[PDB]
Amino acid sequence: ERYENLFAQLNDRREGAFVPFVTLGDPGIEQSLKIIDTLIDAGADALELGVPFSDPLADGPTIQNANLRAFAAGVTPAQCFEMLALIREKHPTIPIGLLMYANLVFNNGIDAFYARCEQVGVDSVLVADVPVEESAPFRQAALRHNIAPIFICPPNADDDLLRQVASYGRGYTYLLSHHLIEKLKEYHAAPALQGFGISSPEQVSAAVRAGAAGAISGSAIVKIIEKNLASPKQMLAELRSFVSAMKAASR
């Protein structure tokens, strides 16, 4: 619902989107909340929040460290949902997406997980280790709870995959680092967003010109966090700068 309103509004303004990503509870519950508020203040159109998983076999060292930090803070999925409720209570319209690992969703029942997401105000869920081939129970539970199932369109994707992603996904299509936007639109795929390697304003511009509805910046934001670790008050302003210095590239 929120993604739809967003793209609709971003279309009446001839602009794209800039979605940043960060790990919840990193480097702490308090600092994390302050980090996200800063991100939205700068210009974050939507958010992609990761829940700390013990064995993130699909994330680079950058994100691995973040999880470690969260765990070092005693951060748990439960506290993450406590945070999401707080974020939602302060920002009612910004789309919030979660980056999950299958086991954290499957653990207490798939249906129950998506129910909690709807309850707290989450808008979409991308399960990193669930390809469309195994997505059935996940996307079905998501749809039943008004949650958008996000699917990744890899660089080595084929026509068959394009059609599935187009019909199974909602909210937006996660694109991994021109014609690939043609098919999706032809198949009526959720507004496509380019990700991976998106760390510069020009990359965002070329993405919109390519036909994308916007661009997601992966570790681009996380890379900034860690580099200002010992300096909290510096990290925030450091982030404000980049975000604003990126959303502008979508107008």
């Binding site: 998983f53 013990s54 064995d55 993130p56 076999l57 699909a58 994330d59 680079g60 691995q64 748990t76 999925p77 439960a78 299958a102 086991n103 954290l104 499957f106 653990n107 207490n108 990193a128 280790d129 669930v130 390809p131 469309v132 081939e133 195994e134 699917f151 990744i152 369109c153 890899p154 660089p155 080595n156 994707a157 084929d158 995959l161 991994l176």
Partner: protein
């Protein structure tokens, strides 16, 4: 869409990032093709026979069962080139890699046996090879670390998490996510995403096939039960496979009990874990109430794994195979017993299987039973660990 069934009941599947699906589908197609190619089978058989040393002996213990009605045979995978059963399927997977056109090899290892096997196979067949190994295992299994390097393999210590098999696995997957175009991921156990569980079983099934032929020749009948240790599940499924349709033959898998199941320090997810999704599969996992993966423990590096192959979880669910656990101390006693009474030094992994066979015998000494224990590997790699322990005592 797949050529083969990715599931064993509720267990199995292909829970990997979308980017790796093409690699898995290509591997499955190559495997199916190879299985039908008489030329591939002949080459594989040639390597197994003339390079690896198959068939391996089936040895009758003539001292450890004294005073009981148990007749025990040991399937000698410890006599295979490399010192463990791991060699069997690496040769097959290496031939598959070449069949596909890959020139590099990625692998993970715990007891270092799969690493050495991957390295020796790569050296022989002209493939590049890098191995991930938990820093803890790099130390307690140092002998295999040296061997791997001498053969031109790159050994990469993993300090993440518990610094053991699980952690090495995570790295191998992360690595393949970015180098899957020129490298084949040679998974070392009957686990992970389809088609690995199926491929590993098929490339290890000669263990059970030979055992059946040898036991029939020597005893004129099938075993009452075959027993194997279960880390990821490759040696056990290799032993089990050919006997699955022989309903009279009991299939017993032995998970490591570590310091005791009740201590929480063990590696027995099949019987004391909970189904979850990790390492590309839906299978029993040792995990927190929250769904985080728990770190496992075993005196044996090769069994220190928080999960287990999907086919074992399935065979257990339907009651075809039974699974039990053996503690560090029970495995150590079996190790000493085999050394002193049969002159065979077994890997600590294999010692868990032997330990359970000894328990079956000792618990009911008048029960007439013909048992086969899969001696998955030799214990030269554990010599320093067992000594450093028997010393404290």
């Amino acid at each position: 869409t797949t050529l083969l069934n990715p599931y064993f009941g509720e267990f199995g599947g292909m829970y990997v990032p979308q980017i790796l699906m093409p690699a898995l589908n290509q591997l499955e197609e190559a495997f199916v093709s190879a299985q039908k190619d008489p030329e591939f089978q002949a080459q594989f058989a040639d390597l197994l026979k003339n390079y690896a040393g198959r068939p391996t002996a089936l040895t009758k213990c003539q001292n450890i069962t004294a005073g009981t009605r148990t007749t025990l045979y040991l399937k000698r995978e410890d006599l295979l080139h490399g010192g463990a059963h791991k060699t069997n399927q690496v040769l097959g997977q290496a031939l598959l890699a070449k069949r596909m056109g890959k020139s590099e090899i990625i692998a993970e290892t715990g007891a270092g046996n799969h690493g050495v096997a991957s390295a020796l196979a790569s050296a022989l067949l002209g493939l590049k090879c890098r191995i991930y190994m938990g820093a803890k295992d790099v130390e307690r299994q140092s002998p295999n670390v040296f061997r791997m390097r001498l053969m031109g393999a790159e050994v990469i210590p993993v300090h993440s998490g518990s610094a053991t098999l699980k952690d090495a696995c995570n790295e191998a997957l992360r690595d393949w996510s970015g180098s899957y175009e020129t490298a084949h991921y040679m998974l070392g156990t009957a686990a992970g995403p389809h088609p690995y569980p199926t491929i590993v079983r098929e490339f290890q099934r000669m263990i059970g096939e030979e055992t059946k032929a040898q036991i029939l020749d020597k005893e004129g009948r099938l075993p009452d039960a075959v027993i194997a240790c279960v880390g990821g599940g490759s040696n056990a499924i290799g032993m089990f496979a050919d006997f699955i349709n022989d309903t009279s033959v009991g299939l017993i898998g032995v998970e490591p009990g570590g310091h005791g199941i009740e201590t929480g320090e063990h590696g027995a997810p099949l019987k004391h874990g909970r189904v979850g999704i990790y390492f590309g599969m839906k299978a029993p996992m040792m995990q927190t109430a929250d769904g985080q993966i728990e770190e496992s423990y075993s005196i044996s590096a090769g069994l220190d794994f928080p999960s287990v192959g999907p086919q074992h979880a399935y065979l257990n669910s339907i009651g075809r195979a039974d699974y039990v656990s053996i503690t560090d101390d029970e495995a150590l006693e079996a190790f000493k017993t085999l050394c002193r009474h049969e002159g065979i030094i077994p890997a600590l992994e294999s010692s868990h299987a032997l330990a359970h066979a000894l328990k079956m015998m000792r618990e009911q000494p008048e029960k007439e039973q013909l048992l086969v224990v899969n001696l998955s590997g030799r214990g030269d790699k554990d010599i320093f660990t067992v000594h450093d322990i028997l010393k404290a005592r």
